[PDB]
Design a binder for this molecule. Structure first.
Ligand SMILES: CCOC(=O)N1CCS[C@H](c2cccs2)CC1
Length: 127
């Protein structure tokens, strides 16, 4: 079995900035979710080899994880906050697509997503 290459976290061809909203996404949003007791499955790309999930990347074609998001924020990969918000939402959606309601991993995603929604509700106006 083999894992795909991870999502890119650097691309010198891609225009970048550091907005107040992106700083909030790192300092408040990512930090809050990263320290949570349920963060660990989401802190790096899904290792379908180690987890013995050969169908994971057959089903999930747009993988995303908080390790990738963390590096994107720290490396100033994004142009705007919406790109990063979309990455978080992709991560949660992949979890709900692949897994079953009530699975431990889904309960973990739901807890992180609740905090995500609480923090992005107060995303500062641009700036
Ligand atoms: C981060 C998204 O991870 C996943 O969706 N998978 C698919 C099967 S659940 C498995 C785990 C269950 C409980 C702890 S880790 C993680 C990998």
């Amino acid at each position: 079995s083999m894992n795909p290459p991870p999502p890119e976290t650097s691309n010198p061809n891609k225009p970048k900035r550091q907005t107040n909203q992106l700083q909030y996404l790192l300092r408040v949003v990512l930090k809050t979710l990263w320290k949570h007791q349920f963060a660990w499955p989401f802190q790096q790309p899904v290792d379908a080899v180690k987890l013995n999930l050969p169908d994971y990347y057959k089903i999930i074609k747009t993988p995303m994880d908080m390790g990738t998001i963390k590096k994107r924020l720290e490396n100033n990969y994004y142009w705007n906050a919406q790109e990063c918000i979309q990455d978080f939402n992709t991560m949660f959606t992949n979890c709900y697509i692949y897994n079953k309601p009530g699975d431990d991993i889904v309960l973990m995603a739901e807890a992180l997503e609740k905090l995500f929604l609480q923090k992005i509700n107060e995303l500062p106006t641009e700036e």
